[PDB]
Ligand binder design. Structure first.
Ligand SMILES: *Cc1c(COP(=O)(O)O)cnc(C)c1O
Ligand SMILES: *Cc1c(COP(=O)(O)O)cnc(C)c1O
Ligand SMILES: OC[C@H]1O[C@H](O)[C@H](O)[C@@H](O)[C@@H]1O
Ligand SMILES: OC[C@H]1O[C@H](O)[C@H](O)[C@@H](O)[C@@H]1O
Lengths: 813, 813
């Protein structure tokens, strides 16, 4: 008896076989017992929640079984540490990966509800800035689909990336209260809360170093399930929330100081701000995470790297290296060398940018008072690492200065990237050209010392959210010719090359794109009361606003199109709707000026009667993952025009390719590989190559030369300076003009002519619908390489030492 | 079709008929799908939660049906506004009121679990200080049991009353993180969030006054169900939580300033601290609550008082009077007189104390900057009210000064009590002697102007939590002679007088008390490693520490008992375990010194070998509702010794009476009525009566007179002064001695002799178990009047204008 009785406590049978009668029963149960509502007062939001809780049950049954499986099998575990996870919406993705969509649609329909209406109630979970955070999300999806025992570890920010409002043509920021109505997917785990220490000092007793007199902040984990595609594997994303440890009133009010650590996501994309609060955030996630990892490993350390892999997403969680050493040496009392060998074999670092202003260099004064023991450990790591450099390159003192983890100057700093290379067994770039640039520029010295460490892992996007979910029309016409295997084996899209001359397929691809454009236009009119002509080429550039991404170059082209129509009003031109969207970091003055310029150009272009519906410029407000899922499937032309050598990889580019848009871009990041897969003849590559940018830097970039030699460019700069785009405040864009003319690090003028000419060729091909569509088919069919399943498979085999698998686990019952 | 399909969405059938097989099924469901756990990792806490969620389902089904019933019947609604609701534990109370206890016990037993272990996992919801907050909780229970459409309205504090730790014999405060693990009973209602305004200014436009330029704080409601006893009626307690309205980082961090309004309960019991944060809390609950009330009434105002009753628990929510006037006049644009007539007919005020330092008088400077429009309205109310006084008492200018809502001085203040009397149709005291003291002392002037307003509503406690729940042994031996009708008709206990000479009943009452003492001793040893001799008289004084409650008088008696044993070591004395417990407000120096004195006396008494087990003094740490439910059923003697005229009513006194303890106390508060019900011959009344205290005040209280005339008292004061109870710090209690000797507002010395003598008589009767028990039966049998069902029935018929009912609603299915 006794404990044997508890055997009845099983997940044995759950909310159903996955069909209509039971879905309806559970939906009714949740509407009343979970939400405490009834049909008389229920709102569409209430019904959305009832459907979400219903679907969550099926997810939870699999989640429990997956974790029970991992405990029994005891596979090597992969921990993906990131300060960002841009997850987006969850309801549809869950229904799709669990094959519940059809039944839920019928169940809601029979109850007198419309599921598509419900689905649109859900808003993004935006705990990320853009590319890096969304890559982490795509990776989570892929690791689950590939059966890896992976855990995503980050911070549960109370407020994710701000909501962007456009007022008077300018960006205004609004806090993203994403949890107001709650989050039905996450599960609070207060019982697993852990302490994280700050400040204090180090004392050296007889048996080692001791970090004492610290202030404590508790880390409370919240777990979110992440489902693999139809394999019944559900992995976990664990995010930490800061809590205060446990006169009088003020002491209780002051608990907010500790809880501020997880209050808001720093809104910087590709830019380092050395704020102490940000440093606390980084150590917070690292300390709680590693405790969790070691605890889980325990329920000696020679086998740790055989059971644990820690992947560092950028240098954000780099403190994991000195923290793991601290724990092993100070707490587990292992000798230094043994601990270091363990640390290096466990950690791997992924770099995401080559721009100096984006890399982390923390002032040592900040590190000595907030984390004294870590700074001590960092200096010791440096000394031993430099000893190795000196032995490998005797007498090369300059190299010692260059490779040091410590940067000298008035403000002493720790170069976190060097710390990561020294403490990781693998370091990777995110696109072939980027990983190569790494090996011969910023990390050349390190590659020369340890060549074996340097790898490449070209980025990817998940075909579930970025094709099956966001573009059902495209997914179905594709499935009708090659089946559904491609969904978890994207290289099968290659089979579509056999239909490049098939009249029905050409017909279908174009009909789908058009249906998408029609629907997107309906979306814009509905929620923003913005009209766009669907029988125009949808020219889209959506990504964070940056000088390096060159939205300004796009701007020059749009003004070029406008001026050309005014010059010859009665000459035909392929009608276009140029859409530019993206958020600017709150303190990035130029990026905000750029947003104002885009809206100001629209104010002129969209209201000039001679232009009419031949050209329209729209700034897409609040670009985020849910908007990307909408606009990308409706795009004809994808703008990927960063200065060659600046965009490490890009991923938006891959989304557009997979969804039927042709690409105009530079030979930068992954564009290079996309062009290689599709064939340059099916791409619109233009401008300076990395070699060309470098030669210009060698001789000196003089924008005045281009200005003096290109009349059409001069006309535009004169209009800007003139106040033609800001009549009421003539000098409004003076900062943009001066930067372009005298301080342009990204050489906009140098690529202007080739850009305008390439755009002419784009228009030329669009004039011929049949050939445009045929080229589109050639892009879609060769986008297979950019599935994040491919990327993750490589990380697993070449870095983590684990074998990917499409073995499915049995359904719960 | 269409909307007709939604008819399937019904509470129709729920988690079961209320029996074992289905309880087990749902418990299993919640353990896995709600908690995301399994039997391998589940902890007792996890299982407690699974049982709580299981029981919650049954509660929710009734909650939905009750609210649907109220909408259809449209009864007059009662709103009980309080800044405190001391709810305590919910699981058992819920099982008892829904008659689910037996089945849940069997269901858990069959699953290999022990329900009593699970139940003890739950901790109190302590959003109250003591008597006033617990009265509100007892009232909620009774209103639901009496079928009234009642709603309790308050604030959802993040931290309730602090947890008291005793360190080195002193009280230390620890924040009560009551929500750490969550609260399964409440339901967040973000969709019903409302705005509350602060600061700003008033401008007088052409059509009225306008409150502009305010700062907004949002009020988000959380609803908790409160079940009536077996009538399937489930009412609501709605508590508001503060949220901020919707460079950049600091602006987001600063949202905490607004959310601080609902962060912590001010820990003052019977004492006014005019802190601005407290004023914000009061207006916060009032503004959100009244909006809610008017909204609910709308889905003209002449009928408002026929549909609405607003009861003000103390002056805490007094701003409801000027706020309702503001809304009616400024927003609904009604004329002043009509609005005032509506306001007075809607509001009623309950006073809870006569001590001057406990009453609210807000500085007008504070009110003019935080709530300018309310201060304007308050001055207008005052002017019109004083005009009425002047007409009723021509030429009595002193009366005008005395009754004014405005108190003059260096610091101008608004007397909130006067505001309440002026704006309410009923004003009540909480015990006969208190309501009479009100009529002839602090509110004499108002009673003379409007005698019809003044009422009495003697307090009560609910027999569900305070008998059936906390003392199952007593409840069953009672049920075996008179059935269970008494549970919701306590006057039936009167039937037990027929068993005062019944040998089996006498036997049973004493066996139950003894079982209770044995179990309480087991509890103390288990969790505090404190031994107490169960074959000793349990002398208990549990309530907040206060000079007016005279724990110090108790202290004098204990030292008297100790000195007497030392004087005649070999003389027999009835063995006693004197227990004193209760929290002191954090800033109340004397109360904290008193706690230290209690522990210091114990340090001497409990370790003196001559005394041994004949006398033991214990300070019960962290007295709270859950401890009261434990210690009260084990008490033999109830200490209710406040100076006559200071304790408005008391309720702990009623708890002890209902649970089998005899009472030693003054003729104060409800003690008077308890003595009247049981007969003074069955009580231990002693000391000065109100008349005696007053005569002493007239001539001047000189404590030295008593000191000079009572040798045993002098001995004690000498020991205190001496350092006999603090050898290492001889003058530690100098402040207590000086206050007693020279500044004792509560005349401890004046009641010492009669107190000691009365205690001798208590011991005399305890020596005779049969007669002690017979007197106990006479107390229990006459405690019926103190059921809060009686109290609420009176509020309903004499103030609210609604008829109580024991009609049961059908079970959900
Ligand atoms: C894919 C994605 C990105 C990354 O876009 P890039 O053009 O590679 O910088 C940024 N934001 C969102 C919302 C995304 O979906
Ligand atoms: C009943 C109760 C009170 C009120 O006690 P009095 O002696 O009337 O002041 C205070 N605290 C708790 C925890 C209670 O249960
Ligand atoms: O690696 C994921 C992404 O990280 C950063 O956002 C880089 O700017 C981008 O090029 C890269 O694609
Ligand atoms: O009215 C409920 C209670 O309120 C206050 O705590 C009074 O001190 C007390 O005497 C009264 O019983």
């Amino acid at each position: 008896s006794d404990q044997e009785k508890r055997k009845q406590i099983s997940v044995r049978g759950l909310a159903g076989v996955e069909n209509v009668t039971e879905l309806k029963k559970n939906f009714n149960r949740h509407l009343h017992f979970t939400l405490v509502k009834d049909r008389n007062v229920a709102t569409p939001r209430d019904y959305y929640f009832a459907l979400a809780h219903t679907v969550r049950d099926h997810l939870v049954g699999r989640w429990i079984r997956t974790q029970q499986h991992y405990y029994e099998k005891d596979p090597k575990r992969i921990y993906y540490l990131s300060l960002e996870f841009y997850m987006g919406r969850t309801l549809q993705n869950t229904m799709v990966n669990l094959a519940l969509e059809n039944a839920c649609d019928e169940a809601t329909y029979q109850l007198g509800l419309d599921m598509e209406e419900l689905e649109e109630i859900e808003e993004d979970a935006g705990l990320g800035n853009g590319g890096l955070g969304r890559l982490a999300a795509c990776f989570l999806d892929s690791m689950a689909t590939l059966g890896l025992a992976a855990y995503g570890y980050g911070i549960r920010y109370e407020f994710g990336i701000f909501n962007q409002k456009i007022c008077g043509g300018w960006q205004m920021e609004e806090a993203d209260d994403w949890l107001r109505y709650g989050n039905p997917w996450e599960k609070a785990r207060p019982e697993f809360t852990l302490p994280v220490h700050f400040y204090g000092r180090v004392e050296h007793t007889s048996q080692g170093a001791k970090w004492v007199d610290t202030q404590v902040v508790l880390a409370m984990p919240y777990d979110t399930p992440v489902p693999g595609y139809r394999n019944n594997v559900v992995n976990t994303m664990r995010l930490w929330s800061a809590k205060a440890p446990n006169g009088y009133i003020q002491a209780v009010l002051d608990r907010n100081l500790a809880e501020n650590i997880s209050r808001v996501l720093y809104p910087n994309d590709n830019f380092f701000e050395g704020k102490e609060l940000r440093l606390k955030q980084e150590y917070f996630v690292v300390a709680a995470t590693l405790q969790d990892i070691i605890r889980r490993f325990k329920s000696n350390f020679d086998a740790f790297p055989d059971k644990v892999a820690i992947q560092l997403n950028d240098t954000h969680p780099s403190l994991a290296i000195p923290e793991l050493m601290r724990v092993l040496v100070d707490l587990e009392r292992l000798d230094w060398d043994k601990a270091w060998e363990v640390t290096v074999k466990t950690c791997a670092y992924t770099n995401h940018t080559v721009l100096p202003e984006a890399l982390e260099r923390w002032p040592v004064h900040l590190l000595e008072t907030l984390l004294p023991r870590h700074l001590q450990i960092i200096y010791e790591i440096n000394q031993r690492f430099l000893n190795r450099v000196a032995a490998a390159f005797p007498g090369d003192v300059d190299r010692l200065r260059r490779m040091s983890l410590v940067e000298e100057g008035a403000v002493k700093r720790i170069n976190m990237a060097h710390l990561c290379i020294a403490g990781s067994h693998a370091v990777n770039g995110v696109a072939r050209i980027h990983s190569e640039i790494l090996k011969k520029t910023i990390f050349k010295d390190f590659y020369e010392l340890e060549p074996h460490k340097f790898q490449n892992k070209t980025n990817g996007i998940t075909p579930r959210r970025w094709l099956v979910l966001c573009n059902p029309g495209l997914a179905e016409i594709i499935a009708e010719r090659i089946g559904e295997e491609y969904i978890s084996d994207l290289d099968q899209l290659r089979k579509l090359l056999s239909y490049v001359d098939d009249e029905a397929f050409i017909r279908d691809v174009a009909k789908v794109k058009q249906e998408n454009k029609l629907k997107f236009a309906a979306y814009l009119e509905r929620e923003y009361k913005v009209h766009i002509n669907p029988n125009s080429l949808f020219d889209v550039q959506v990504k964070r606003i940056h000088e390096y991404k060159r939205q300004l170059l796009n701007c020059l082209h749009v003004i070029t199109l406008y001026n050309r129509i005014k010059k010859e009003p009665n000459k035909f031109v392929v009608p276009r709707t140029v859409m530019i969207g993206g958020k600017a970091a709150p303190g990035y003055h130029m990026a905000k000026m750029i947003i104002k310029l885009i809206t100001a150009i629209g104010d002129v272009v969209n209201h000039d009667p001679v232009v009419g519906d031949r050209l329209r410029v729209i700034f897409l407000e609040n670009y985020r993952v849910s908007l990307a899922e909408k606009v990308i499937p409706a795009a004809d032309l994808s703008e990927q025009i960063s200065t060659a050598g600046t965009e490490a990889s890009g991923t938006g580019n891959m989304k557009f390719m997979l969804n039927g848009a042709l690409t105009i871009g530079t030979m930068d990041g992954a564009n290079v590989e996309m062009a290689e897969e599709a064939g340059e003849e099916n791409f619109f590559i233009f401008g300076m190559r990395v070699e060309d940018v470098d030669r210009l830097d060698q001789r000196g970039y003089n924008a005045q030369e281009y200005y003096d030699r290109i009349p059409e460019l001069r006309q535009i700069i004169e209009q800007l300076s003139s106040g033609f785009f800001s009549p009421k405040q003539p000098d409004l864009f003076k900062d943009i003009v001066n930067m372009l003319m005298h301080h342009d690090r990204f050489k906009v003028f140098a690529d202007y002519e080739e850009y305008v000419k390439c755009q002419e060729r784009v228009s030329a091909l669009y004039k011929n619908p049949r050939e445009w569509t045929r080229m589109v088919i050639r892009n879609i069919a060769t986008s297979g390489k950019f599935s994040s399943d491919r990327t993750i498979a490589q990380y697993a085999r070449e870095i983590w030492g684990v074998e990917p698998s499409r073995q499915r686990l049995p359904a719960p019952d």
